Design a protein around this ligand. Structure first.
Ligand SMILES: COc1ccc2nc(Nc3cc(C(F)(F)c4ccc(F)cc4)nc(N[C@H]4CC[C@H](O)CC4)n3)sc2n1
Length: 250
């Protein structure tokens, strides 16, 4: 990827403050609107932070966020991404609650599923798929973000007990992301501790069917939440199941 000099960035407004660093609305070259992600000094190594960018810069799909480049010269170092006009999906769903047709919500799931099928094919495991790590562009296009990395509520049981990450553990997470979309940004397992969530899931409890989700939609969420990873569908199959409902039973 392209190396960006710090002098080429204009920081306009701080919009986010995470564990791994700050996010700012900015401009590159006084031209392109960008989301600038500054590393949090100490909280993560520059090597790892940079390697995430490298991974991302060679994964090209319409439903995966893109970078303009990396700014290494002046610490704190940063990644420079394209600016997604409507911010993160979890917040978007929350602020637009009541203004969504079920068809639109299904389309958002489809967008995320297309990007995840691409990642799955590339043998790239996300590890932290959640509405909070998806972004909203124009005409409500959803892109997957933060997908180049090396939250118990989105973790499959084999992940929360044994750290067995896989594309099928991403599918469990996608099921929870589907629940977030159809509940229009509710927090899954609200006010429950990790111990309680683990126990509930190990018991057979699953997130309740949201009002805007049809029976078929909920059947698909549940297939993502099967106990054994091998009983869950791959993203490339989920994509077509989700598309078939868009015609039939919403
Ligand atoms: C991978 O990092 C990236 C890449 C691109 C990108 N684009 C972004 N755009 C916006 C736009 C707006 C907005 F202001 F235009 C906006 C806000 C609310 C709303 F309802 C509608 C629009 N808010 C935000 N907020 C951030 C979301 C992600 C979070 O971790 C940090 C805050 N990002 S972030 C980003 N990160």
């Amino acid at each position: 990827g392209s190396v960006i000099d710090p002098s080429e960035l204009t920081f306009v407004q701080e919009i986010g403050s995470g564990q791994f660093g700050l996010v700012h609305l900015g401009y590159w070259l006084n031209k392109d609107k960008v989301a600038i992600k500054t590393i949090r000094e100490g909280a993560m190594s520059e090597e790892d932070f940079i390697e995430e960018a490298e991974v991302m810069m060679k994964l090209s799909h319409p439903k995966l966020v893109q970078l303009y480049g990396v700014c290494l010269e002046q610490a704190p170092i940063c990644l420079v991404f394209e600016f997604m006009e409507h911010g993160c999906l979890s917040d978007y769903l929350r602020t637009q609650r009541g203004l969504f047709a079920a068809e639109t919500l299904l389309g958002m799931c489809l967008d995320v599923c297309e990007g995840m099928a691409y990642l799955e094919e590339a043998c790239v495991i996300h590890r932290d798929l959640a509405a909070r790590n998806c972004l909203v562009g124009e005409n409500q296009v959803i892109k997957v973000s933060d997908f180049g990395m090396t939250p118990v509520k989105w973790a499959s049981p084999e992940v929360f007990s044994f750290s067995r990450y896989s594309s099928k553990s991403d599918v469990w997470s996608f099921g929870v992301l589907m629940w977030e979309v159809f509940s229009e940004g509710k927090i899954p397992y609200e006010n429950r501790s990790n111990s309680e969530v683990v126990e509930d899931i190990s018991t057979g409890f699953r997130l309740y069917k949201p009002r805007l989700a049809s029976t078929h939609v909920y059947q698909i969420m549940n297939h993502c939440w099967k106990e054994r990873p091998e009983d869950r569908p791959a993203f490339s199959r989920l994509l077509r199941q989700l598309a078939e409902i868009a015609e039939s039973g919403l």
